[PDB]
Amino acid sequence: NLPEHWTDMNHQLFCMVQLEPGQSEYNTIKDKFTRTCSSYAIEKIERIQNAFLWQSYQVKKRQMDIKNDHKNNERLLFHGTDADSVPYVNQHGFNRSCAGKNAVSYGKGTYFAVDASYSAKDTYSKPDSNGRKHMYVVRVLTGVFTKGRAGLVTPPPKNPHNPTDLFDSVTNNTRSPKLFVVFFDNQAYPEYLITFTA
Amino acid sequence: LPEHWTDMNHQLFCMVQLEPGQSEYNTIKDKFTRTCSSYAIEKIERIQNAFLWQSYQVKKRQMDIKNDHKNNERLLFHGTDADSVPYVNQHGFNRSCAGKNAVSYGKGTYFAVDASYSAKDTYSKPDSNGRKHMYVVRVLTGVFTKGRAGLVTPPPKNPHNPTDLFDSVTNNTRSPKLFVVFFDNQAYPEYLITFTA
Ligand SMILES: CCOc1ccc2c(=O)[nH]c3sccc3c2c1
C-alpha cells in the first residue's frame, strides 16, 4: 500500500529522503512551519519512508474512517523532540510510555501541536550539541475529540454509561484546539523531520 | 477474518459462547485444565473483534518478515478483574492500564504460560458473585530475552544497533513461565473463560 510518490527503497523497509527547496512538497512544509516560527531557519526537511509504521497507521486510519461518520479524522501536526529520540521515532514512531509531562497536561499520552511555535520551545525540540533543533510533521488520527484532563491514560468515554466507546483523542480546548493527545500506538505517522537552527 | 469465526450480520464485534463438548470448546478447556482442573468452567466465549484481529495480523506479518522465520506466536493466559473485561474484549491489552501487579520484568502487559498463574485472585479477581475471568491470548512473543524492572520497551538485540529490539521479555529464556509485550496489537484476546474456585 506504499504511496507511489515515495522513492524506490529497493526491498528495504526504511529510508529518510532529503527534500529540495523549490518543490511544492518542501515549500508547503516550510510555509506551515514559518507561519508561527519565522525567527528560526530550516537546515533541511526529510520525508520519512517507514513501510511498517505506514501500514499499521493506514489500518488504524481505515478503522477510524469506518467507525466515525464521514469525519476528517486526520490532522497534520508538529512534534518537537530531542536528538537522542530521533532514531527511535524514525523506526518505531511515537511511544506514550516515553512521553514527557507537558507544562499543561490534558492526559498521559503523546502531544502534537497545531503551531510549530509550540513544538519549537527548547523544552520539546532540545538543541543538540551542534545547536540543531528537530521537529516532526505528523499525520495524527485526532478523530472525534473532547477537552482532556491530567488524569487520563486513555481518551475518555463519549458516554459515562458506555465506558468502552471512547473519543479518539483529547485537546486543550475544543473551540480552538492548539494541542492534541493520543493514547495508542500507530495513531500518528511521523511523515517529515525538520532540522532547524536559530 | 478466520474460518472458525461464525457470521456477525456485518457487525465488527461479537462474543460467541462455545457449546460444551464440541472440538473448539474441548481444545480450549484442555489448555486450562492442564493446571486448573480444580476450577469449574461456567463458560468459554470466542472473541470476534475484526479491528483487533486486523491490527494483530498486520503486526504478525511484519514480525514474520523482520525475524525472517515464523514461530513468532504463542498461546498464553491473562487473568483480569470483571471491570476490565469489556475494555479488553473491545480494545485488547493496554500497558497504560496495568497496576502494581504488572511489575518486575517491565512496564508492559503480562501473559502466563500456565493458567494456574493467571488463576491467582490478585490477577483474575473474583467478582461480587465469585466469578473469575481469564483470556486465552495469541501473543507475538517473537525473539525474547530476560526482562528486568523498569523496561519501557524490550532491550536491543545488540547495543551497537539500539533500535533493532527483542519482541518480548520473559522471567527465564530457557524455561519461560511469563512474557511481557510493550506494544499495542502484539496480543489478540481469542477466548474468555469464566470460572470459579
Ligand atoms: C510477575 C507478574 O506476572 C504476571 C503474570 C500473569 C498476569 C495475568 O495473567 N494478569 C495480570 S493483571 C495484572 C498483572 C497480571 C499478570 C502478571
UniProtKB/Swiss-Prot annotation, chain B:
Domain PARP catalytic, chain residue ranges per copy: 1-197
Cellular localisation: Nucleus
Recorded superkingdom: Eukaryota
The protein's role, per its UniProt record: Mono-ADP-ribosyltransferase that mediates mono-ADP-ribosylation of target proteins. Acts as a negative regulator of transcription.
Recorded family membership: Belongs to the ARTD/PARP family.
Name of the protein in its database record: Protein mono-ADP-ribosyltransferase PARP15
Species for this entry: Homo sapiens
Positions spanned in the full protein: 482 to 678 of 678
